Amino acid sequence: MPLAKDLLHPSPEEEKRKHKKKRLVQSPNSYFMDVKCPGCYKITTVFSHAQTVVLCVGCSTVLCQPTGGKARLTEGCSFRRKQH
């Protein structure tokens, strides 16, 4: 900072790069998404940082694999939050 700035409506790239609880208006950026993926024949809702796998009846096993960060997905997928 040049040490005299005052910011009352901060840009969303210096507030969206920061840690989840360090944000200047605190809501996380995590979302839900619909996964289509072709070996599943139903539209499974999945959490972006799912943790434990989401699975469904339509697939044998192919929907998610676990990852500590963002959940792994396989083949065709979409995402829309929608409205967080």
Binding site: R23, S27, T44, T45, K82
Partner: protein, 150 residues
């Protein structure tokens, strides 16, 4: 500040402002209550139920559909675990450390660790006793810790 762990970091999620999540499909009260009842039949903790509901169903927390949370539903029904989930899992660690300590009597680390976990149980339990979630006439013991986890 932490006197219950040697940590320095964080261990909670950020939570959103709103009382409605995600607002494109929040399902209905009916669906998730049935699911909760069926999961709680199997003896699953509120933690586990929250995880599976979040990711698979279009609900996140069930606090955003109705003002009740998973524990509150359970508690009012009268079908609930018989001690808080955290307290259970604490007791369970102290059992596991105790079993390891029986195996090895040269493991100084394990002795130190056991003390810490046990202290942590007592402070949490004291809190539950005062607010009538535990009876004051129960108390933590080696003996009874085993019996709970089994």
């Amino acid at each position: 500040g932490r006197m219950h762990a040697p940590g320095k970091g964080l261990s909670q999620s950020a939570l959103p402002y709103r009382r409605s999540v995600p607002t494109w499909l929040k399902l209905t009260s009916d669906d998730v209550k049935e699911q909760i009842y069926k999961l709680a039949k199997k003896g699953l903790t509120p933690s586990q139920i929250g995880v599976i509901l979040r990711d698979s169903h279009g609900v996140a927390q069930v606090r955003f559909v109705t003002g009740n949370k998973i524990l509150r539903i359970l508690k009012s029904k009268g079908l609930a675990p018989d001690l808080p989930e955290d307290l259970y899992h604490l007791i369970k660690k102290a059992v596991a450390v105790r079993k390891h300590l029986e195996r090895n009597r040269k493991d100084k680390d394990a002795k130190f660790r056991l003390i810490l976990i046990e202290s942590r149980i007592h402070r949490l339990a004291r809190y539950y006793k005062t607010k009538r979630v535990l009876p004051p006439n129960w108390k933590y013991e080696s003996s009874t810790a085993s019996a709970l986890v089994a």
